Amino acid sequence: SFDPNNPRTITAQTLEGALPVDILLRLNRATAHAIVEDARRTLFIGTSLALVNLRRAHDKHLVERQPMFATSDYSSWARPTVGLKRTFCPR
Amino acid sequence: SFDPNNPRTITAQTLEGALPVDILLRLNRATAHAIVEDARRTLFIGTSLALVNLRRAHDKHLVERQPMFATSDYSSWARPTVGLKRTFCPR
Amino acid sequence: LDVDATLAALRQEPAEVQCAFGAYVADARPDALVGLMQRFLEEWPGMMPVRPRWAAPAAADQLLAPGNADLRLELHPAFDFFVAPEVDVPGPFAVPQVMGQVRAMPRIINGNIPLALCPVDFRDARGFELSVDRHRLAPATVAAVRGAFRDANYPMVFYIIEAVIHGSERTFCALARLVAQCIQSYWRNTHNAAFVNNFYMVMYINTYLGNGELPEDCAAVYKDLLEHVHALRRLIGEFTLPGDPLGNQPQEELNHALADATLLPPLIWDCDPILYRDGLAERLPELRVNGAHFQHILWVEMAQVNFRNVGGGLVHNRPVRNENQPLHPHHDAEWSVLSKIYYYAVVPAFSRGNCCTMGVRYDRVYQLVQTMVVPETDEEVGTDDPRHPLHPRNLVPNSLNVLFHNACVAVDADAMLILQETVTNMAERTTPLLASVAPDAGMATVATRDMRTHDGSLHHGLLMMAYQPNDATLLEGAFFYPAPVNALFACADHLGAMRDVGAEVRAAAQHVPCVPHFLGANYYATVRQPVAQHAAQSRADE
Amino acid sequence: NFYMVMYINTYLGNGELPEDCAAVYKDLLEHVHALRRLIGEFTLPGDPL
Numbered sequence: 001s002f003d004p005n006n007p008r009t010i011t012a013q014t015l016e017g018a019l020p021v022d023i024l025l026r027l028n029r030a031t032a033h034a035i036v037e038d039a040r041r042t043l044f045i046g047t048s049l050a051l052v053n054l055r056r057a058h059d060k061h062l063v064e065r066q067p068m069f070a071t072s073d074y075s076s077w078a079r080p081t082v083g084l085k086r087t088f089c090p091r
Numbered sequence: 092s093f094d095p096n097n098p099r100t101i102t103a104q105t106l107e108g109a110l111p112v113d114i115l116l117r118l119n120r121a122t123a124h125a126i127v128e129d130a131r132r133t134l135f136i137g138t139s140l141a142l143v144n145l146r147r148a149h150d151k152h153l154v155e156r157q158p159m160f161a162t163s164d165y166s167s168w169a170r171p172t173v174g175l176k177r178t179f180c181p182r
Numbered sequence: 183l184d185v186d187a188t189l190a191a192l193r194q195e196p197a198e199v200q201c202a203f204g205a206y207v208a209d210a211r212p213d214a215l216v217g218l219m220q221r222f223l224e225e226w227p228g229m230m231p232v233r234p235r236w237a238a239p240a241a242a243d244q245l246l247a248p249g250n251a252d253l254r255l256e257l258h259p260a261f262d263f264f265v266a267p268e269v270d271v272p273g274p275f276a277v278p279q280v281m282g283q284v285r286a287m288p289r290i291i292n293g294n295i296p297l298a299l300c301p302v303d304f305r306d307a308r309g310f311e312l313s314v315d316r317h318r319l320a321p322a323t324v325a326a327v328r329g330a331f332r333d334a335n336y337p338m339v340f341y342i343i344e345a346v347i348h349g350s351e352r353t354f355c356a357l358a359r360l361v362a363q364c365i366q367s368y369w370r371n372t373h374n375a376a377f378v379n380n381f382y383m384v385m386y387i388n389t390y391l392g393n394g395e396l397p398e399d400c401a402a403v404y405k406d407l408l409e410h411v412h413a414l415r416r417l418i419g420e421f422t423l424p425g426d427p428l429g430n431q432p433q434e435e436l437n438h439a440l441a442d443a444t445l446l447p448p449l450i451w452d453c454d455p456i457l458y459r460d461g462l463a464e465r466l467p468e469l470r471v472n473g474a475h476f477q478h479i480l481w482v483e484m485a486q487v488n489f490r491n492v493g494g495g496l497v498h499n500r501p502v503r504n505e506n507q508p509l510h511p512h513h514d515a516e517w518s519v520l521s522k523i524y525y526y527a528v529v530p531a532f533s534r535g536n537c538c539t540m541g542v543r544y545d546r547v548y549q550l551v552q553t554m555v556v557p558e559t560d561e562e563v564g565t566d567d568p569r570h571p572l573h574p575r576n577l578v579p580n581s582l583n584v585l586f587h588n589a590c591v592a593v594d595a596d597a598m599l600i601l602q603e604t605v606t607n608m609a610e611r612t613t614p615l616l617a618s619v620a621p622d623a624g625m626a627t628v629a630t631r632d633m634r635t636h637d638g639s640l641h642h643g644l645l646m647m648a649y650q651p652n653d654a655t656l657l658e659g660a661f662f663y664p665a666p667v668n669a670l671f672a673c674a675d676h677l678g679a680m681r682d683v684g685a686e687v688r689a690a691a692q693h694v695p696c697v698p699h700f701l702g703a704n705y706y707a708t709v710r711q712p713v714a715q716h717a718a719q720s721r722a723d724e
Numbered sequence: 725n726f727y728m729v730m731y732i733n734t735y736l737g738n739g740e741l742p743e744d745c746a747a748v749y750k751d752l753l754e755h756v757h758a759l760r761r762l763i764g765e766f767t768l769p770g771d772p773l
Contacts, residue, residue: 004166020552020554020555023553024170024553024555024578024580027170027580031165036168039168039169040168040545040549044484044548044549044552045484047549047552047553048484048552048605051602052602052605054554054556055602057558058558058599062596068355069352069355069503069504071504072504085355085390085394086355086356086358086359087359087362087391087394088395090359090562090594090596091562158579160654160655161654161655161656162654162656162657164657169549170580171546171549171580171656171660172580172657173579173580173581173584173588173656174654174656175577175587175588175655176587176588176735176739179740182574233769233771238769332754334753335733335737335738337738371738371743372738372743589738590738590739590740652730652734693769719765
C-alpha cells in the first residue's frame with residue numbers, strides 16, 4: 001500500500017486499502033521528527049478505521065448489542081429499566 | 092558410498108550422496124593420525140550438509156519460522172517490536 | 183504544639199549545611215511529564231554530596247552515642263527538625279546555593295516516629311494485639327495473593343489491559359468477557375490472582391462478575407480482599423468518641439489520617455477526589471498540576487486525542503453511565519478512603535518493598551491494541567481449527583495476538599475483537615500532582631499556621647508489582663517508564679526500565695528511595711520514611 | 725546448570741510446565757534471591773572505599 005523507507009507517502013488515500021494485516025505486513029518488510037510524528041498520527045487513525053471496518057465485516061454475523069447499563073429512562077413510568085451484563089453473547 | 096577399511100576414500104564427492112543414514116550404515120559395516128584426523132573433519136562437514144539437506148526436505152512441509160527475539164528494530168517508530176516464544180509450532 | 187521558641191533558639195548557630203535532597207521540593211513547568219525524570223536523574227547525584235541521614239537511620243542505639251550529630255535534632259516527640267536551603271517552597275527546579283537554615287514540621291502520624299525510638303518489635307506487637315478476633319485472611323487467600331505479587335513473570339498483557347481500561351465503568355462492563363477469560367486462564371495456570379495491583383479493578387471484579395463466570399474457589403479470594411478492607415475501614419469507627427465536627431470536618435478525619443479527605447490517594451483515575459478536596463476552605467488547600475490549576479475536561483475520542491498535550495487538564499472517562507450533566511462526581515465519598523486504605527495498608531503488606539508506581543506510554547499501547555488479526559468466520563470453531571486467531575498460521579509477528587500467546591492465555595476471537603471499544607474514551611497521558619494542605623484544627627497553632635505539607639500523586643498511572651529485567655521478548659522501556667511517588671512505592675530495579683540509565687545513579691539507588699524532587703521530598707510528605715522501612719524489614723505473618 | 729534453571733522459569737515459566745513442576749524452579753530461584761538479600765542487611769551503608 002506504500003513503501004516503508006519513505007514516511008511521507010502514508011495518508012488516508014493509501015491506508016483505506018484493507019484490514020490492519022496489510023498495515024502491519026507493510027511495516028514488517030522495511031529495510032525530521034515532525035515528519036515521522038505526523039506519519040504516526042495518520043497511521044494511528046488509519047489503523048483505527050481499518051479495525052472498525054474489520055469489526056463491521058465480522059459483526060454482520062453477530063447478535064444485536066443491547067444497552068449494558070440501566071437507569072437510562074425516558075418511558076420509565078411504564079417499565080423499570082434494567083441493564084444487561086455482557087457476560088457472554090457469542091455467535 | 093565408500094569403503095570403511097580405507098579412510099582416504101571419503102570426500103565431498105562421495106559424501107554428497109544421501110542422508111546421514113547412509114553415512115552411519117556405511118560406518119556400521121566396517122571390518123597415520125593425520126589421515127584419520129582429516130577424514131574425521133571432512134566426515135563432520137559431510138554429515139552437517141546431509142543434515143541440512145534432510146531438514147530442507149522435511150521443512151518443505153512446515154510453518155514459516157518467525158524471528159524469536161524482539162528489539163530488532165528498523166521501522167520501530169510505527170510498531171513496537173515483539174518477539175515470539177517458539178513453545179510449539181508443529182505441523 | 184509550642185516550638186517557636188525552640189526554633190528561635192536553634193537558629194543562633196550559623197549553619198550546618200550537609201545535604202539538600204530529602205528536604206527540597208520544586209515546582210516544574212508543564213514541559214514533558216515523561217522526560218522530567220530524565221532531567222532529574224542527570225541532576226540527582228549532584229544533590230547528594232554526602233549520604234542523607236534520613237534515608238539510612240543512625241542505628242538501634244548509636245543514636246545515643248555521646249557525640250553523634252543526630253541527638254542535636256531530636257528533641258520533641260511530635261516534630262521533626264532538619265536543615266534545608268533558605269528558600270520558599272516550592273522553588274526552582276535547579277537547586278540553589280544559599281546558606282542553610284533549620285526548619286521544623288510535625289509528624290502528622292505516630293508511625294513517623296523513627297525506628298530507634300519505636301522499635302519494629304513493638305509495632306508488630308501492637309498490630310498482633312489489634313488483630314485478635316477482628317477479622318482475618320484465610321490461608322489460601324493470602325497464599326494466592328502473595329504468589330501473584332511475588333511472581334516475576336506476570337503476563338505483560340494484563341498490565342496492558344489495566345492501562346487501556348484505566349478504571350472506567352463502561353469499558354470494564356464492555357471487556358467483561360475478555361477479563362473473565364483472562365482471570366480463568368491465569369487461575370487454572372498457576373493458582374494465583376490477577377489485577378490485584380489495581381483497586382478499582384478488584385472492586386469491579388466482585389461487584390459485577392461475582393456470582394457469575396468465576397469459579398467458586400477463585401472468587402472467594404476477590405471477596406476476601408474486599409471484606410478485609412471493609413473490616414479495616416470499620417476499625418477506626420470504634421476508636422473515635424462521637425463528637426462535634428470541629429473544623430467543618432467530622433471527628434473521624436481528625437483522629438485517623440487516612441479517613442481525612444484532604445489527603446490525596448497515590449493513584450487517582452478522575453477528579454472524584456479533587457472536587458471533594460476543594461470542598462473545604464478553612465485550611466486553604468492548593469493543588470498544582472504542572473503549574474496549571476486544572477481544567478475539568480470530558481471524555482476524548484480518536485477524533486481529538488493529541489497525545490502531546492502537556493497543560494493542566496484531566497479527563498473523566500465517559501463521566502457517568504447515564505447522566506451526562508455538567509460537573510458532578512460519579513462516586514461516593516468513602517470510595518477514595520477505601521482506595522487509600524488498600525494502597526497504604528495492604529499493598530506494602532504483601533509486596534514488602536517491591537512495587538513501584540509506573541508512568542505509562544499511552545501512545546504505543548494504543549498503537550498496539552488496534553493491530554489485531556482475526557479471520558472472517560460465521561461461527562466460532564475453537565483453538566484447534568486453523569481459522570482460530572491463536573493457531574500458529576495467522577500469528578503475524580509484532581502483532582497483539584502474539585502477546586496473548588506469550589502468556590498461554592486462552593481467549594476467543596469475539597472477546598479479542600471486543601477490544602475495539604476502547605476507542606470511545608482515550609487516555610491522553612499520565613501526569614504528576616502536588617497537593618498542599620495546612621495542618622488541620624488539631625495542629626492549628628499560631629506557630630504552625632505556615633508549616634504546610636507537600637504530597638504528590640499520579641493521575642492515570644499504573645502500579646506494577648515486580649520487575650522482569652531478564653526477558654527479551656519485549657524491549658525494556660517499551661511501555662512503562664518508572665515514576666515513584668512515595669517511599670513505599672519506590673524500588674530500585676524498576677530504574678533499569680528507564681532508558682539511558684546512568685552508571686553511577688543505579689549504584690547509589692539501593693540505599694535511597696528515588697522520589698523525584700517535583701513529587702514531594704521525604705520531610706515535606708505526610709507518609710515519612712520510617713513507616714516504609716518498617717514495612718520493608720519487618721516479618722509478621724503478612 | 726545455573727543458566728538453565730534461570731532460563732526455565734524466565735521463558736518456559738507459566739507455559740508448558742505442569743501446574744506443579746514449575747513450582748520447584750520458582751522456589752529454587754526465590755531462595756537464591758533471599759540469600760542474596762541476606763548480605764544486604766548485614767552491611768552498614770557507607771561510601772565505596
